[PDB]
Design a binder for this molecule. Structure first.
Ligand SMILES: O=C(Nc1ccc(-c2ccnc(Nc3ccc(N4CCOCC4)cc3)n2)cc1)[C@H]1CCCN1
Length: 288
């Protein structure tokens, strides 16, 4: 059931749009009926040949993944009479963990936060087994299936390690989520499981802020660097702050033991950052 016909793939709702991609909720009814299944469809926006090649790689990555905490691949639609490509995924009703945390604060306490943490770690452990580097871990990129299950959604930025190295060097990017980046990613464009672990620390910070507006990583880092500055000088200041131990603060209400996990992920010493496997084991112990 891996190939979906464009004639039966009906638009329902916008789910998230960027400069280079869009995801929509759609209904797939091939028995032309109503019983058809609801899916999520990712398509490029402002597509180029190079972006299409990248998208094919992103599709093959998601298809290669089978895990409870990773959005389920369903197939591809070769749309415009088989002259274009769209990616078909399962549909997750509850949106992004960022939006969910903000809307449903009153049924989320600390143990629930840590249940999400743990599930994120486990998806990340699984990604590690395929030598994939996510490069974009953020609560906006984590999806909520139900109150008991979250899933890493979006592999737009994901790279596969060379078979002979432990790091991937990106030259290209331009625009990047700099406030979630490890310092060597900012300085050297080097990406690794260790840099994913750094980003994971920032995700843990996001959770314990419960998405209160002025507590976001960009809001905080810009407070710290000076919310006056503009263009490159922002990145200059961020690198300098990080290299010399400026860090996000402990959120209000966050236990020491949980902030400590964050600060250990935020190690400038790449080789001393914890593994996703020891993070899962730690978090699971704090949860009991
Ligand atoms: O948005 C992105 N990626 C993305 C990846 C996967 C999904 C996805 C895959 C499966 N289910 C859902 N569910 C979902 C349900 C509701 C909502 N919302 C959106 C607005 O408010 C209602 C809840 C968002 C996602 N979303 C959504 C977006 C990336 C690519 C374009 C820009 N940034």
């Amino acid at each position: 059931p891996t190939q979906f016909e464009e004639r039966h793939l009906k638009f329902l709702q916008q789910l998230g749009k960027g400069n280079f991609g869009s995801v929509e909720m759609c209904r797939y009814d091939p028995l032309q009926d109503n019983t058809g299944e609801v899916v999520a469809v990712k398509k490029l926006q402002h597509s180029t040949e190079e972006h299409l090649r990248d998208f094919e790689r992103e599709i093959e990555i998601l298809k290669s993944l089978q895990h409870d905490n990773i959005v389920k691949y369903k197939g591809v639609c070769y749309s415009a009479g088989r002259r274009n490509l769209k990616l078909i995924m399962e549909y997750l009703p509850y949106g992004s963990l960022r939006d969910y945390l903000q809307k449903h604060k009153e049924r989320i306490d600390h143990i629930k936060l840590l249940q999400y943490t743990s599930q994120i770690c486990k998806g990340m452990e699984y990604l590690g087994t395929k030598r994939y580097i996510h490069r974009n871990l953020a609560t906006r990129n984590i999806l909520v299936e139900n109150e008991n299950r979250v899933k890493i959604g979006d592999f737009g930025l994901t790279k596969v390690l060379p078979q002979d190295k432990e790091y991937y060097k990106v030259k290209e990017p331009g625009e990047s989520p700099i406030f979630w980046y490890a310092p060597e990613s900012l300085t050297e464009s080097k990406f690794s499981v260790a840099s994913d672990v750094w980003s994971f620390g920032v995700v843990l910070y996001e959770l314990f802020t419960y998405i209160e507006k002025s507590k976001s990583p960009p809001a905080e880092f810009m407070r710290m660097i000076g919310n006056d500055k503009q263009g490159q000088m922002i990145v200059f200041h961020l690198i300098e702050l990080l290299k010399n131990n400026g860090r996000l603060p402990r959120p209000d209400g966050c236990p020491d033991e949980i902030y400590m996990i964050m600060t250990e992920c935020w190690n400038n010493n790449v080789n001393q950052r914890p593994s996703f496997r020891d993070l899962a084991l730690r978090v699971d112990q704090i949860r009991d």
